[PDB]
């Protein structure tokens, strides 16, 4: 029956008295995987494992190869076998038997998602996508039922790690498969919030705890509800307070940077600049630690690259400015420091994506780049045309690159917001800024006919500039506004779901670290370098309840009346 | 505003040493650039001086850094693009985004 | 000078051809296509503006 794909007969055999646990035997599984494995599917799996690979792809490939060649978790192997050959009903039937199912469902969805892209067939890709969506919905519904029934056991199940199913929890698989919907559900968000506040109660007003951060003695009093001296350690170990402290430290670092840059910058650095160098050194140490924890994947994110560039720019500025003898180098170092200051200051937008009020709006900015690009494309085309035409008709043989580019591009660009593109388009006023020769740093003069009268006709220039201004300054901006409005309306319903994923990423990254306040984390890193079952049963019970719920919902059609009529 | 003002002031003048004018240049002018006027007339070397003050005695902005001779030392190829980007961002994109969110 | 002016106008005409050729980019093409549908709004705007 398994060979012939008879799901109903398989279910009947299982439920009528067959012992599946005893059924699955080493010889049986070897004979099943060695030969009945589709050769096409075998080759596709080998190609996928060899080329793309992943934390679970290699595991499943190794298990398959081991079984073909010759705890145990055989039921999981059978479920994998059923899934890999695209058997919907048989896969569900086998899934109904596994002890751990939510993890199994998430892993199956991940496997289908990674295997669907490779396949060239459109119809097969669509079928696999539909199956993956079905399994995702199954997992979401099951976990919602479990959390609604019991909360602490649901959180424990989340924390529970498999014994080499994939070596990962449900959270890790869901995030790896970018399953936004599963994490966006209330249970996972509440778990992340509880982990975020740490010891502190989640019901406390946020302003109370923010106020207590500054004044230490206020923490000893009963203002903070610690229950969800020992209070100090329980408070300063909370990642929320560590994050707030780091934000304060970063703001103070920006203030010091600006003060040194504008108010106190001399040939020989003074004490404040040395303190600034020390702060940048601790930031660089943190960046090096972050490099160590991750691989080259860490450089696939824009903000990380920006931070690395800022640090390298700071080092370059240090290098340039140590030549106190030469004045021409101190200014260059200061300019490098100014650019690095811009880079550092832009980091606040990244760090403040967690505020729960600004974060979603910041996230949605990434979705308007196509509208911006179209706007810039039209603007650039129009600027090029107008500038070239105007320059050609007005002055002749410019012969200076900087002023060709100044007239052709810069002035039409300035015409976008306010001032009319050219005061030379009108003969009413001209000269006293002209230069017949190129010796001076002024625009080339207008072409002149006999006498000193300008030769260009106004009846072709004035309409040109009028049309250009009417187009750029009004129509295009309004079109941009309309496109932005439509995009916001479309993407608002999904922005919050997308933002919750990044919130999880934060609430995991900050909690993973040792949680030491930023100013003196160096000591921690230095001396670390010196030092450098029951839940599954409950899951099955809840799965049985959920399956019975599905069956009752199906039977709620009330069509049995006609059958009883017959 | 903070980023642009700090960068521009740092590259252009040196050691300001007067709080009211540090704050006037860093914040007030970029803020005025939101509605209309270009943030800085000093970004371009085509016109300068006659409003400068080498010393702080008068109530005028501090002069621009000077190299050998009286020529300004700041390069335009980093200032002009900076101001262009800042204006394109604040004056147009942000206002339209605000309109969309209000709608 | 007249020939140069004619060349400038012809340059404008040629440069406007990029918008036509780039209607196939799969990102800009749809937005370029939709421009043809706002001419009535532009016309009403211009009518009121001219009267005033
Ligand atoms: C020490 C001096 C030089 C700086 C004084 C400026 C203050 C106005 C700044 C400094 C630290 C800032 C605070 C740092 C962290 C936060 C938490 C933030 O809310 C959250 O991040 C909550 C996260 C969540 O909801 O999950 C709201 C602003 C606040 C109080 C910031 C608001 C403005 C503060 C008080
Ligand atoms: C003035 C110059 C010479 C030095 C630069 C100082 C900056 C570090 C200050 C100036 C303006 C300040 C900001 C004004 C507005 C905000 C947003 C504000 O965001 C929130 O509080 C989020 C609240 C929520 O979402 O719940 C936090 C303070 C911050 C970054 C302030 C703190 C730091 C800034 C950039
Ligand atoms: C060579 C001269 C012009 C000086 C160069 C210094 C700045 C003008 C550079 C340094 C970092 C650059 C920024 C790096 C990242 C971005 C975000 C980008 O917009 C987005 O990517 C939105 C989506 C997202 O959130 O990532 C627009 C340009 C900007 C501000 C870049 C524009 C130019 C900046 C400010
Ligand atoms: C085509 C649409 C999208 C916008 C057109 C805007 C109108 C306001 C333009 C169209 C024709 C233009 C006119 C065409 C010719 C002239 C003569 C010109 O006066 C001259 O100097 C002509 C040359 C000479 O001195 O003999 C002053 C502008 C005016 C009225 C132009 C001003 C603005 C007008 C009415
Ligand atoms: C990046 C996007 C979001 C906006 C860019 C706007 C453009 C209109 C900028 C990009 C590069 C800029 C140009 C970069 C360099 C120069 C040379 C500059 O002339 C100089 O004085 C250079 C220094 C010297 O005198 O030698 C005049 C402006 C121009 C054409 C800049 C004017 C405006 C440009 C084309
Ligand atoms: C500078 C003067 C003296 C000479 C004129 C040169 C032009 C031919 C250059 C200047 C600006 C350039 C444009 C800046 C922006 C764009 C849009 C861009 O469109 C895309 O890449 C579509 C991408 C996608 O949709 O996937 C292609 C390059 C183009 C036409 C660039 C190529 C040609 C332009 C018009
Ligand atoms: C006699 C003087 C004013 C000089 C004439 C030269 C230009 C001002 C002329 C030459 C070609 C004309 C353009 C030919 C086509 C169009 C598209 C038109 O808008 C649309 O048709 C949108 C729908 C579409 O995509 O076809 C607006 C005017 C414009 C730019 C015309 C306006 C005036 C242009 C640029
Ligand atoms: F939002 C927008 F796009 F404005 C627009 C919105 C709604 C309806 C039409 C338009 C539109 C479209 C185009 C086109 F799609 F055809 F490009 C336009 N082209 C021009 C001009 N062409 O050349 C000029 C600049 C160079 C000098 C000669 C005049 C202005 N104005 C347009 C208006
Ligand atoms: F509505 C808006 F936000 F404009 C916007 C709307 C739609 C798409 C993108 C943006 C956007 C986003 C950001 C970011 F989210 F990344 F912050 C921007 N940042 C900047 C600049 N950064 O620095 C500058 C000022 C300081 C001097 C250097 C230049 C301008 N322009 C942005 C445009």
UniProtKB/Swiss-Prot annotation, chain C:
Cytoplasmic domain ranges by topology: 24-28
Effect of disrupting the coding gene: Trpm8-deficient mice have severe behavioral deficits in response to cold stimuli.
Parts of the chain that traverse the membrane: 1-23, 29-52
Tissues where the protein occurs: Expressed in dorsal root and trigeminal ganglia. Specifically expressed in a subset of pain- and temperature-sensing neurons. Not expressed in heavily myelinated neurons. Not expressed in neurons expressing TRPA1 or TRPV1.
Post-translational modification: N-glycosylation is not essential for but facilitates cell surface expression, multimerization, association with lipid rafts and ion channel activity.
Subcellular location: Cell membrane; Membrane raft
Domain of life: Eukaryota
Family: Belongs to the transient receptor (TC 1.A.4) family. LTrpC subfamily. TRPM8 sub-subfamily.
Protein role: Non-selective ion channel permeable to monovalent and divalent cations, including Na(+), K(+), and Ca(2+), with higher permeability for Ca(2+). Activated by multiple factors, such as temperature, voltage, pressure, and changes in osmolality. Activated by cool temperatures (<23-28 degrees Celsius) and by chemical ligands evoking a sensation of coolness, such as menthol and icilin, therefore plays a central role in the detection of environmental cold temperatures.
Domain description: Cooling agents bind within a pocket formed entirely by the S1-S4 helices that opens to the cytoplasm.
Assembly notes: Homotetramer. Interacts (via N-terminus and C-terminus domains) with TCAF1; the interaction stimulates TRPM8 channel activity. Interacts (via N-terminus and C-terminus domains) with TCAF2; the interaction inhibits TRPM8 channel activity.
Name by which UniProt lists this protein: Transient receptor potential cation channel subfamily M member 8
Range of the intact protein held here: 826 to 877 of 1104
């Amino acid at each position: 029956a398994l060979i012939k794909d008879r799901p109903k007969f398989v279910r009947l055999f299982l439920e009528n008295g067959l012992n599946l646990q005893k059924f699955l035997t080493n010889e049986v599984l070897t004979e099943l995987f060695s030969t009945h494995f589709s050769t096409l599917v075998y080759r596709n799996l080998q190609i996928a494992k060899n080329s793309y690979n992943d934390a679970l792809l290699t595991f499943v490939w190794k298990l398959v190869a081991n079984f073909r060649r010759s705890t145990r978790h055989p039921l999981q192997a059978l479920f994998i076998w059923a899934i890999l050959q695209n058997k919907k009903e048989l896969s569900k039937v086998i899934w109904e038997q596994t002890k751990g199912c939510t993890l199994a469902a998430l892993g199956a969805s991940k496997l289908l998602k990674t295997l669907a892209k490779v396949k060239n067939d459109i119809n097969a890709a669509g079928e696999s996508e539909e199956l993956a969506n079905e399994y995702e919905t199954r997992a979401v519904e099951l976990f919602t039922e479990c959390y609604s029934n019991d909360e602490d056991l649901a959180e424990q199940l989340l924390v529970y790690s498999c014994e080499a199913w994939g070596g990962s929890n449900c959270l890790e698989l869901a995030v790896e498969a970018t399953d936004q919907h599963f994490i966006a559900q209330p249970g996972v968000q509440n778990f992340l919030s509880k982990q975020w506040y740490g010891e502190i109660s989640r019901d406390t007003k946020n302003w109370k705890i923010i106020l207590c951060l500054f004044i230490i003695p206020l923490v000893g009093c009963g203002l903070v509800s610690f229950r969800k001296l020992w209070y100090y350690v329980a408070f300063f170990t909370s990642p929320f307070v560590v994050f707030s402290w780091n934000v304060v430290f970063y703001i103070a670092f920006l203030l010091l940077f600006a003060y040194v840059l504008l108010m106190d910058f001399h040939s020989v650095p003074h004490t404040p600049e040395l303190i600034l160098y020390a702060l940048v050194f601790v930031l660089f140490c943190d960046e090096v630690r972050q490099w160590y924890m991750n691989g080259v994947n860490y450089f696939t994110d824009l903000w990380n690259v920006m931070d690395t560039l800022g640090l390298f720019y700071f080092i370059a500025g240090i290098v340039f400015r140590l030549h106190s003898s030469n004045k021409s180098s101190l200014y260059s170092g200061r300019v490098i420091f100014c650019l690095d200051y811009i880079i550092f200051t832009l980091r606040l937008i990244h760090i403040f994506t967690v505020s729960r009020n600004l974060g979603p709006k910041i996230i949605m900015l990434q979705r308007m780049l196509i509208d911006v690009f179209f706007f810039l494309f039209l603007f650039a085309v129009w600027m090029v045309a107008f500038g070239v035409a105007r320059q050609g008709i007005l002055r002749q043989n410019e012969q200076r690159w900087r002023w060709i580019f100044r007239s052709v591009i810069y002035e039409p660009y300035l015409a976008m917001f306010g001032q009319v593109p050219s005061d030379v388009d009108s003969t009413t006023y001209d000269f006293s800024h002209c230069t017949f020769s190129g010796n001076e740093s002024k625009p080339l003069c207008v072409e002149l006919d006999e006498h000193n009268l300008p030769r260009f006709p106004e009846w072709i220039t004035i309409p040109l500039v009028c049309i250009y201004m009417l187009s750029t300054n009004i129509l295009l901006v309004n079109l941009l506004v309309a496109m932005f409005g439509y995009t916001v309306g479309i993407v608002q319903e999904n922005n919050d779901q997308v933002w919750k994923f990044q919130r999880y990423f934060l609430v995991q990254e900050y909690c993973n670290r040792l949680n030491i306040p930023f100013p003196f984390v160096v000591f921690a890193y230095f001396y670390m370098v010196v030092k450098k079952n029951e839940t599954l049963a409950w899951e099955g019970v809840m799965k049985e309840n959920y399956l019975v719920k599905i069956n009752t919902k199906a039977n709620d059609n009330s069509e049995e009346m006609r059958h009883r009529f017959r």
